[PDB]
């Protein structure tokens, strides 16, 4: 029809996150039967039925049941959520990392179902499909100049916080956008102290659901498997730590990074893992996992009432005597009204191949 009234950089962003064909590739790479259960026919009830199937699996794992009880619970999940292993027999889910891989499948399906409900809208004719999907996002995306001051700071925050033990790749900032989701500033806890700009990475199929619904907490019917500090919204002060959760590949080496204003408040500092630190706050507002390396406060600056923890990072003198020590920090909030998305980064992953 008529011309797209959006900036070309926004057009490329809408092009990249609304690629349903790309979500099919990622789902096929996770052994999801896109033929028997098409993504266009995915409903919330189907994902909810799979969540209840994973809960029965989590009960068998925590009860040591590795016999028929687990075989039928896995077959129930593999039936409600169809898979495709060729002519192979589907494997048994019995470990935390195996269970975590299946929950990440369901979390991805929920974000694809949101994106698919967005692309299959109507009002075709007057508005370009690019503007149609951007308007249905209900979230502003404004490109920033490469010579602007914000671009220099986010670039320094990008590279100076790249972890040393993540030498598998380097990251190049391609584009930078300003994020203003509708209804997010009206619920943000502006009263809370310890306002910091923290990283967050996610898979490519989750950005339409993230930009449109914000960062959400797991539903109650989902198992607690995989949450080191309970169900919440996890952030990090190291850019590469969050960029690993983008799961960029050598064939698909372009992902997105989200910078949000997190109202941490009084931090509950933890060392050992605890999937119930939410009930351990008692007046506190956030749980902070202490790592071995973190940026020092000497290089900290402020960007619109929020502290940017720039690098380079140094040793924190933190060690877990009776357990495992995190390499870097983890910030967890237990309510979406403590998070306000601000920046979106178009990041190119230069893998060490
Ligand atoms: N996504 C991030 O940028 C991120 C930054 C810092 C610490 C993080 C911890 N997470 C995280 C925590 C839990 C999970 C899932 C939740 C359910 C599926 N199995 C594990 C996935 C990611 N994500 C983090």
Closest ligand 1 atom to 100 CA: 19
Asked if 299 and 159 touch (Cβ cutoff 8 Å), the reply is no
CA-nearest residue for atom 13, ligand 1, is 227
242 known member of a binding site: yes
* Best CA proximity match to 329, nearest among 340, 343, 342, 315: 315
Cα-to-centroid distance, 324 and ligand 1 (Å): 17
Residue 244 structure tokens: 């690993």
* The two structure tokens encoding residue 146: 């490469």
Among 142, 128, 186, which Cα is nearest to 337's?
186
In the annotation, is 113 catalytic? no
- Pairing type for strands 339-351 and 169-181 reads antiparallel
Cα–Cα distance measured from residue 120 to residue 132, given in angstroms and rounded to the nearest whole number: 10
Tell me: is residue 202 an annotated ligand-binding position.
yes
Q: Which atom of ligand 1 is nearest to the CA of 200?
A: 3
Sign of CA dihedral 92, 96, 97, 103: positive
> What is the C-alpha to C-alpha distance for residues 161 and 156, in angstroms, rounded to an integer?
8
Residues in contact with ligand 1 by the CB-under-6-Å rule are 100, 103-104, 199-202, 226-227, 234-236, 241-242, 245, 330
Q: Which of 95, 111, 227 to mutate to test the pocket of ligand 1 (most atoms within 8 A of CB)?
A: 227
Query: Closest Cα to atom 21, ligand 1: which residue?
Result: 226
Q: What is the distance in A from the centroid of ligand 1 to the CA of 125?
A: 41
Give the span between the Cα atoms of 23 and 41, in whole angstroms. 14
Q: Which fold has domain 11-119?
A: Poly(ADP-ribose) Polymerase; domain 1 (1.20.142)
State the span(s) of the chain assigned CATH 3.90.228.10. Answer: 138-351
Instruction: Compute the chain's Rg from CA coordinates.
Output: 21
Determine the distance separating the centroid of ligand 1 and the alpha carbon of 147, expressed in angstroms.
33
Which tokens belong to 105?
């499948």
How many Å lie between the centroid of ligand 1 and the Cα of residue 121? 31
The CB density around residue 240, as the number of other CB atoms within 10 Å, is 23
Measured by CA distance, the residue closest to atom 15 of ligand 1 is: 226
- Measured by CA distance, the residue closest to atom 12 of ligand 1 is 227
Residue labelled with tokens 């109202």:
263
Ligand 1 atom index nearest CA of 201:
3
Query: Which residue spans of the chain are classified as CATH 1.20.142.10?
Result: 11-119
Dihedrals φ, ψ of 298, to 5°?
-75, -25
Question: Rounded to the nearest 5°, which phi and psi values hold at 72?
Answer: -75, -35
Angle at 116 between CA 36 and CA 172, to 5 degrees: 110
d(CA 157, CA 311): 7
Q: Which CATH number fits domain 138-351: 3.30.70.141, 3.90.1150.10, 3.40.50.300, 3.90.228.10?
A: 3.90.228.10
Structure tokens at 232: 């919440």
Alpha-carbon distances of 92 from 48, 102, 261, rounded to whole Å: 21, 11, 41
Contacts of 37 (CB under 8 A, 6+ apart): 46, 81, 82
Residue 113 neighbours by CB under 8 Å, 6+ apart: 39, 42, 43, 44, 47
Q: Quote the ligand 1 centre to 3 CA distance (angstroms).
A: 40
209 is in an annotated binding site: yes
- Residue among 219, 275, 205 nearest 17 (CA): 205
What sign does the dihedral 15-21-27-29 (CA atoms) show? negative
- Is 201 annotated as belonging to a binding site? yes
What is the C-alpha to C-alpha distance for residues 234 and 198, in angstroms, rounded to an integer? 10
Resolution (A): 2.7
How would you write the chain as a 3-class SS string? CCCCCCCHHHHHHHHHHCCHHHHHHHHHHCCECCCCCCHHHCCHHHHHHHHHHHHHHHHHHHCCCCCHHHHHHHHHHHHHCCECCCCCCCCCCCCHHHHHHHHHHHHHHHHHHHHHHHHCCCCECCECHHHHHHHHHCEEEEECCCCCHHHHHHHHHHHCCCCCCCCCEEEEEEEEEEEEECCCCCCCCCCCCCEEEEEEECCHHHHHHHHHHCCCCCCCCCCCCCCCCCCCEEEECCHHHHHHHHCCCCCCCEEEEEEEEEECCCEEEECCCCCCCCCCCCCCCEEEECECEEECHHHEEECCCCEEECCCEEECCCCCCCCCCECCCEEEECCHHHEEEEEEEEEEEEECC
Give the C-alpha separation, 211 to 229, whole Å.
24
Nearest CA to ligand 1 atom 23: 234
Measured in angstroms, how far is the CA atom of residue 130 from the centroid of ligand 1?
Answer: 31
Catalytic, out of 58, 113, 261, 330? 330
Q: Which of 55, 236, 256 to mutate to test the pocket of ligand 1 (most atoms within 8 A of CB)?
A: 236
């Amino acid at each position: 029809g008529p011309e797209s009234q959006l900036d070309l950089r926004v057009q490329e962003l809408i092009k990249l996150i609304c690629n349903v064909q790309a979500m099919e590739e990622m789902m096929m790479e996770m052994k999801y039967n896109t033929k028997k259960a098409p993504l266009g026919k995915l409903t919330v009830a189907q994902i909810k039925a799979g969540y209840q199937s994973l809960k029965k699996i989590e009960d068998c794992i925590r009860a040591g049941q590795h016999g028929r009880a687990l075989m039928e619970a896995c077959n129930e999940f593999y039936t409600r959520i169809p898979h495709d292993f060729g002519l192979r027999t589907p494997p048994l889910i019995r470990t935390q990392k195996e269970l975590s891989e299946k929950i990440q499948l369901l979390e991805a399906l929920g974000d694809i179902e949101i994106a698919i409900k967005l692309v299959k809208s109507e009002r075709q004719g007057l508005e370009h499909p690019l503007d149609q999907h951007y308007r249905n996002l209900h979230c502003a995306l404004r490109p920033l100049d490469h010579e602007s001051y914000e671009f220099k700071v986010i670039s320094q925050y990008l590279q100076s916080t790249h972890a040393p033990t993540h030498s598998d790749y380097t990251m190049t900032l391609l584009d930078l956008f300003e994020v203003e989701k509708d209804g997010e500033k009206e619920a943000f806890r502006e009263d809370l102290h310890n306002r910091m700009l923290l990283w967050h990475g996610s898979r490519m199929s989750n950005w339409v659901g993230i930009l449109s619904h914000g960062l959400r907490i797991a539903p109650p019917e989902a198992p607690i498997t995989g949450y080191m500090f309970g169900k919440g919204i996890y952030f990090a002060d190291m850019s590469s730590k969050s960029a690993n959760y983008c799961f960029a590949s050598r064939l698909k080496n372009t992902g997105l990074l989200l910078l949000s204003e997190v109202a941490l408040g009084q931090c509950n500092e933890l060392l050992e893992a605890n999937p119930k630190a939410e009930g351990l706050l008692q007046g506190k507002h956030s749980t902070k996992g202490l790592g071995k390396m973190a940026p020092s406060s000497a290089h900290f600056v402020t960007l619109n009432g929020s502290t940017v923890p720039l690098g380079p990072a140094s040793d924190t003198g933190i060690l877990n005597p009776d357990g495992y020590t995190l390499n870097y920090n983890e910030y967890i909030v237990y309510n979406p009204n403590q998070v306000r998305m601000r920046y979106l980064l178009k990041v190119q992953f230069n893998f060490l191949q």
